[PDB]
Ligand binder design. Sequence first.
Ligand SMILES: CCCCCCCCCCCCCCCC(=O)OC[C@H](O)CO
Ligand SMILES: [Zn+2]
Ligand SMILES: [Zn+2]
Ligand SMILES: [Zn+2]
Ligand SMILES: [Zn+2]
Lengths: 100, 277
Amino acid sequence: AIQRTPKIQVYSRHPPENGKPNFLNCYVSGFHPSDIEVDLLKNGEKMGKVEHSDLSFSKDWSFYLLYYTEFTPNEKDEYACRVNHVTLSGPRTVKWDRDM
Amino acid sequence: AGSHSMRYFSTTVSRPGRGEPRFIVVGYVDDTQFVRFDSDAASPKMEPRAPWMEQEGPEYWEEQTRRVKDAAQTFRVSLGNLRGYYNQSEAGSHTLQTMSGCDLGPDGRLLRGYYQQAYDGRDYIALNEDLRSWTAADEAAQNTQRKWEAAGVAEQWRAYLEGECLESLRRYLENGKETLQRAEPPKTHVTHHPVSDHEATLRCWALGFYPAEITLTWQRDGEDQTQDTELVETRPGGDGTFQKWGAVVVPSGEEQRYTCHVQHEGLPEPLTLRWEP
Ligand SMILES: CCCCCCCCCCCCCCCC(=O)OC[C@H](O)CO
Ligand SMILES: [Zn+2]
Ligand SMILES: [Zn+2]
Ligand SMILES: [Zn+2]
Ligand SMILES: [Zn+2]
């Protein structure tokens, strides 16, 4: 079996503005096999009501998924995505950068 | 657009001791998902995943459900067969992926038909472009090739890919035209973030575009800095659109020697952008 490590991007749907409702996205891609754990985190805590896209894959057979939830960003709050996969030594946490 | 595609992507994953393999299939027209099936759902059936699909009547959904359940049974059998071909234990989970579908060219004919499989993330077997022959990726897959050659499988796929596959694609393009036939150009802008007193990150953004295909390249003195550019994978907005950015770190005094070039279907002319303080 050829295994592949997930790529991870954490970002918002629309340009973030404090006080305005928005969507927080965690796009994981390029991984194999398909079993994967993905959490969206608010100040280190797992957010509820996180949905995800239907499992699909790319030309090279690697899988991708979008995990997403409503959020309203501000100055106070820190957001992140934590991903676990058999290819990782432990979960990988990527912080939300409002400029990426 | 002049050309369009339809694809079905199925994933079958065994789980020894925990019941039958899980089966998921998703359908896309171009970069737009339009259906799904998940064997682990409460009452598994093919379901719409685009609003324009909701107008298909109940007999459409019943037939698609019948077809995916039939495919699922064959893929569970295949998993068994392949476990044997590779001399593998019954203890481990394995994955069978399939892709099938058709590209419609501007002459209204089949540009390319596909039917191919992967086992544990590696190429296994693929229908060739002539839709009359197979490529096996290894010796084990030659077992499958021999059986499919004897059973006339390629001709069955040829008939589907040149007929119903395209007929369905044409119908979806009509029913979904307001969104499927609309090329949404990227909203673009350049941001600037000092990383020191002497250098800054120039980031070129493309947002809200459809379809996903796009080119985003930073230029300096009219050629591309592909090696000094951080270019992220094109990513979904979650609203049916896509996003991408590319960034370079440059000396403060050379900032205006940099331009970002953006090409996309929905743009009349390619954009050349710059940091506009
Ligand atoms: C195929 C990649 C994923 C596989 C998951 C299975 C469902 C895909 C088919 C969806 C039903 C509508 C099209 C039916 C295709 C079909 O009729 O089969 C072809 C030839 O007829 C073979 O004989
Ligand atoms: Zn078109
Ligand atoms: Zn041999
Ligand atoms: Zn910047
Ligand atoms: Zn200095």
